[PDB]
Design an enzyme around this catalytic site. Structure first.
Site, mmCIF file in Angstrom:
data_model
loop_
_atom_site.group_PDB
_atom_site.id
_atom_site.type_symbol
_atom_site.label_atom_id
_atom_site.label_comp_id
_atom_site.label_asym_id
_atom_site.label_seq_id
_atom_site.Cartn_x
_atom_site.Cartn_y
_atom_site.Cartn_z
ATOM 1 N N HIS B 26 -13.415 8.352 7.612
ATOM 2 C CA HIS B 26 -13.195 7.970 6.220
ATOM 3 C C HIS B 26 -12.153 6.867 6.139
ATOM 4 O O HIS B 26 -10.959 7.141 6.356
ATOM 5 C CB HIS B 26 -12.728 9.192 5.432
ATOM 6 C CG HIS B 26 -13.559 10.408 5.674
ATOM 7 N ND1 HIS B 26 -13.458 11.164 6.824
ATOM 8 C CD2 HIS B 26 -14.512 10.999 4.914
ATOM 9 C CE1 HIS B 26 -14.318 12.169 6.763
ATOM 10 N NE2 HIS B 26 -14.970 12.090 5.615
ATOM 11 N N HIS B 260 -15.556 5.609 0.859
ATOM 12 C CA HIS B 260 -14.942 6.926 0.996
ATOM 13 C C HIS B 260 -15.078 7.469 2.414
ATOM 14 O O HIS B 260 -14.065 7.693 3.088
ATOM 15 C CB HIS B 260 -15.547 7.930 0.007
ATOM 16 C CG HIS B 260 -15.026 9.325 0.175
ATOM 17 N ND1 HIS B 260 -14.246 9.950 -0.775
ATOM 18 C CD2 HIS B 260 -15.158 10.212 1.193
ATOM 19 C CE1 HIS B 260 -13.926 11.162 -0.353
ATOM 20 N NE2 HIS B 260 -14.464 11.343 0.840
ATOM 21 N N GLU B 414 -4.277 35.307 -4.499
ATOM 22 C CA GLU B 414 -4.482 35.659 -3.089
ATOM 23 C C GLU B 414 -4.679 34.428 -2.207
ATOM 24 O O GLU B 414 -4.135 34.362 -1.095
ATOM 25 C CB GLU B 414 -5.689 36.591 -2.907
ATOM 26 C CG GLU B 414 -5.553 37.957 -3.577
ATOM 27 C CD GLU B 414 -5.956 37.934 -5.042
ATOM 28 O OE1 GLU B 414 -6.466 36.892 -5.491
ATOM 29 O OE2 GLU B 414 -5.794 38.960 -5.731
#
Lengths: 676, 676
Positions: B26, B260, B414
């Site tokens: 990338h 990208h 969590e």
């Protein structure tokens, strides 16, 4: 004095009595939220005698531990749930489990309890409602105009999955969604001040939500009702209604975190009843005036449904095509011969990655099956989950799509995508919806995936880049444990198709599913079309790809390793070893076949070697020896990784030969056999 | 022209060349973030020759796909990483994997790539730094005053785990944390407008974060440096720095989502180099003026560390007790004989739930081992994870605790708790930190848990309510798949202790761990102290609890089902069947024992039955037949659920007898045997 007051008291005391009878459960939130529940249900359209009416308003109790509250509402409104069922709260075999189950509880739209899920389910119900209404509503024919109401608590607002879904719901301008926050300043650890001091309202505004605040949600049901009306006037924003309540309202321990999750003391229950005009010596009391008042609302709602049925009948006459399609979906049936659209391949076709075969399937079946919608968690050009020629699901006001669109831009929100998928399925109308990400990050959504299974929802994960086969992205992206995790979850069909025909079978299963979520594990690398594969063979979940009557060994494999097994069969031939090959594209579908079918695929009297480039867990159900990968992967070109780990024709053949040697001169029974 | 400009160009072109050499990776974010990376590293204190210096500033690349950027920085600053390593970007066996790995890459504090994780890791590093500084800093002795810098992208901001951690970081007033948002308006699917339109800044303010906006982060490195200085002045809020950048800055495709995740075209790379004064025919160029300028910063930092070493030496002289404790922790050693604090039980002791035994262990060892800190995800009174007499970790300004506190109120978060635990471990100084929730909701944090394993971090999950044994909360709370999931993950020790001694062994393992995360599966229901258990026996992971020289069968079990197996042995005695019992509290610890130890526990020549009230996955490694639960649970009193599923002494004995019959007159080899 008023019947509204008496109803609120009835709800509260039914919930407290249910918890007392079980000596287990949570009375605090039911006590604090009973006024809001009363107000909301009076504004809702629903038929307790037809829980599937497609234009009902939906209610979701996202703070599902409060479910004594939900059950009390359903009992008082005459759903298929009685006071005797309430007396059996949290008891084995009852219809009033400790957290609501859509499979067991009439009027429970989804299975909630795990925090964060219900609000995301409500986003999905509202997303489906918008898509359904945009598809079928015509001028003078509002076939679908229903709302989604969600109750949630502080815990739900701390769970990241709810942030994901709330960001997306704001973006999607879902003015048909109304959520209610039980702002009672208490969680399990104590005051919310110890861990939750953010400006919740400001955050929800930042997503684009409309806010109404009810400062006294303990008593001001007029304000709650007006907040609902105001929410409905704001058609281009989901609305959060802040309910400031006293947890456990009325209890001696009201406003303290003791009332949260423990049955009330006997004397506390007695003073609750007396001060509200009830008999402290009586339990599960239902004043006839309350059920009469509730029955009146039921009667009005049943008239509304009857008028809706006539509207639908007139719709089918003016638009026979749309009306027949709608009737079909409401009957839970796919289009006749829809599966004629599935592509079929032969060994003369080129090798193709199964993510690309998946894109081809979707391109063929989306035009044929209108109840398919889906999306991707910001991996559309890598999952290949969008069929060209479809429009994105977006508010028309944005210029980016339309509510009639069929492709959802979930963004980088795997967990919420999973729970929203559950809500879309929960809406009904035969929705068969899907969501794409890398297989390794389906695990981000585990909380929702297991609820897909427990809820019996036919959702589909399009889970690409399934193994070290993806190569350079490396071990943070390469599944090892992932298939074992979901195969070990009851009621998940985990397809790992080997080629074009198998990929069509996997979608045939996923789309025809009515009670079982699907995960489709798909490759980045190209795989050859197999000699001996077919849709109908792969639809058995497991099948004999290369039949060898005099087999020294059977190699059972999945996905990309089926072609590997065939190449290993050829190496073994050179060594004078005869091998058969079994392809096991879905273990669950295979497991549900007849015992004699299963034993014909994995018979007695031949050693069986499994080959799959992930964990060996589960594989002893089908094989005597397992060749798998029980360490993390590596960043590099995929062929080099396979070579390193000896997932090569020669590496498999070597272990097949050692497996044959291991059992030499011992007779062997099918791994399917069990002592009990 | 300036050396800052030349350095930025060097970073950009090293990253582009690494991606080109791999033909994978990338280049967009590395190009857009190189100015910020240059500015940040110039403000950081670090020693490339001592990556463990405890007072270094930490850098976390949370958008880990941008890791060509991280590697370029580490190469230019003279870490144990070279240009030749960069040429091997994403190649098998290299030190430059496609996403940074703390186990492989010098200067990589954590393993990132899965989105959302790094920013949560940075919250944990900063949490640990605050706790460490509050514990050891004295007047005139700033032993710890380091900052945590995090780079993150849009995707990270969509993941719920980052919302969780950012809410908590704001609550905890972590002014030692500085995060940088790459605000480049592009994700994988295209414009962020399609799925991510929220007011990010307003949301971060709602958490209590300080905001600095850099409108031109493409070129204004003075503004980036001033934003850092401003962040440091705001000591009571974490700071988010908005970097508005052009993704792929300089590329012909800059500002488009093509740059990208795809290597740039050859002509694009050529025009990049020429317009910045580099040779388009040269790759991996490093101007000597850049490394000289970087070397100067290294020299200043090494002087800072040298002065820190003298400060520490003076500290140890003025505070010999604290200084010895600090030296010990920095050496990675626990206190001598710390394990003398572990409680030991006998069969004359009462039955106790292992969640309560866990609370007792923590009460004994927290006073003895200062590097233990931990918390619970809003389940403190149910997990029993807080030792009485400790103070909560909170900003002193709140009145709710202090930064020297040792108990963390994670709230209902969590997943972030899991990734923050990874950051606390990553800080170093021998932190042994833990987090409590119900076992079934450890699954919410799966994304982080697998990174615990891949990162080799000794974190501990205190995972209570481990099975249907919890009863009334029902199947939304009852693990089925959970242990199989994490046992199938490489490098997770999954302890399911059967009694008091086994629970002490599990903590002995979890706290002495240096490279392996632990999950402790603990019961709500009371279990008897076993005849034949001991800490040192259970520390082998698996051991013979009841030895039977003439066994007809061995029953292997875990946790609550060990006592069940012993009761079944007694029923079998009545039938004339002799059974042995093996307790297998941790499969991983067992697996790593010697082959001959393992075969003495699970020998050849006797059928083996496993008993555990969850999935049978994995159990064929240790047994020939498996008695388990492969369906969801039920809401009801636990004893009735066990009865329903025949997890009773008679139900186990029946299946043991059928297992003996199944193998009658066939000789059997240990399930441990493998053909290869």
């Amino acid at each position: 004095s008023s019947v509204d007051q008496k109803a609120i008291s009835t709800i509260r005391l039914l919930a407290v009595d249910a918890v007392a009878a079980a000596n287990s459960g949570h009375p605090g939130a039911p006590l604090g939220l009973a006024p809001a529940a009363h107000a909301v249900f009076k504004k809702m359209r629903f038929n307790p005698k037809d829980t599937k009416w497609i234009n009902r308003d939906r209610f979701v109790l996202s703070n599902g531990h409060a479910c004594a509250l939900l059950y009390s509402m359903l009992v008082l409104y005459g759903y298929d749930l009685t006071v005797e069922d309430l007396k059996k709260f949290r008891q084995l075999g009852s219809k009033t489990p400790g957290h609501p189950e859509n499979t067991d509880v009439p009027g429970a739209e989804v299975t909630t309890g795990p925090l964060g899920q219900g609000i995301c389910n409500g986003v999905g119900i509202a997303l489906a409602q918008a898509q359904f209404a945009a598809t079928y509503n015509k001028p003078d024919f509002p076939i679908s105009d229903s709302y989604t109401y969600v109750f949630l608590g502080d815990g739900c607002l701390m769970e990241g999955v709810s942030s994901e879904a709330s960001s997306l719901a704001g973006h999607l301008q879902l003015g048909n969604l109304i959520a209610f926050w039980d702002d009672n300043k208490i969680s399990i650890d104590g005051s919310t001040e110890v861990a939750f001091t953010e400006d919740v309202i400001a955050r929800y505004k930042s997503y684009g939500w409309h806010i109404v605040e009810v400062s006294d949600a303990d008593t001001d049901i007029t304000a709650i009702a007006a907040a609902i009306d105001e929410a409905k006037k704001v058609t281009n924003k989901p609305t959060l209604v802040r309910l400031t309540t006293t947890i456990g309202f009325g209890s001696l321990a009201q406003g303290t975190h003791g009332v949260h999750g423990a049955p009330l003391k006997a004397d506390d229950i007695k003073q609750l009843k007396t001060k509200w005009g009830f008999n402290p010596e009586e339990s599960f009391a239902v004043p006839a005036e309350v059920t009469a008042s509730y029955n009146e609302h039921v009667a009005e709602n049943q008239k509304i449904q009857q008028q809706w049925n006539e509207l639908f009948a007139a719709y089918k006459q003016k638009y026979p095509e749309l009306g027949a399609e709608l009737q079909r979906r409401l009957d839970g049936k796919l289009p006749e011969n829809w599966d004629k659209a599935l592509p079929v391949y032969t060994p003369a076709d080129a090798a193709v990655a199964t993510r690309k075969l998946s894109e081809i399937v979707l391109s063929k079946i989306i035009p044929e099956v209108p109840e398919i919608i889906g999306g991707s968690a910001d991996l559309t050009p890598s999952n290949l989950t969008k069929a060209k020629g479809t429009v994105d699901f977006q508010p028309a006001a944005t210029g980016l799509g339309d509510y009639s669109g069929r492709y959802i831009r979930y963004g980088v929100r795997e967990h919420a995508m999973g729970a929203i998928m559950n809500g879309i399925a929960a809406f009904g109308a035969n929705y068969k919806n899907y969501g794409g990400t890398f297989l390794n990050f389906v695990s981000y959504a585990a909380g929702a995936v297991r609820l897909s299974a427990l809820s019996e929802f036919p959702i589909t994960w399009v889970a690409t880049h399934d193994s070290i086969g993806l190569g350079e992205d490396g071990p943070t992206h390469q599944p090892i444990e992932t298939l074992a995790h979901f195969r070990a979850t009851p009621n998940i069909s985990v397809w790992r198709p080997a080629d074009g025909n198998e990929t069509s079978a996997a979608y045939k299963s996923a789309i025809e599913s009515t009670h079982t979520p699907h995960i489709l594990a798909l490759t980045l690398q190209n795989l050859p079309q197999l000699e001996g594969s077919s849709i109908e063979k792969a639809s058995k979940g497991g099948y004999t790809l290369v039949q060898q009557d005099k087999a020294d060994i059977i190699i059972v494999a999945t996905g990309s390793e089926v072609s590997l097994a065939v190449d290993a069969l050829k190496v073994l031939e050179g060594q004078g070893i005869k091998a058969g090959v079994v392809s096991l594209p879905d273990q669950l579908t295979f497991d549900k076949q007849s015992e004699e079918y299963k034993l014909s695929v994995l018979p007695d009297g031949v050693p069986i070697l499994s080959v799959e480039v992930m964990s060996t867990f589960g594989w002893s159900k089908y094989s005597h020896q397992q060749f798998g990968l029980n360490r993390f992967g590596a960043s590099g070109k995929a062929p080099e990784i396979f070579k390193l780990f000896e997932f090569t024709p020669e590496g498999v053949a070597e272990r097949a030969a050692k497996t044959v040697a291991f059992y030499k001169g011992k007779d062997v029974v099918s791994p399917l056999r069990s002592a009990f």
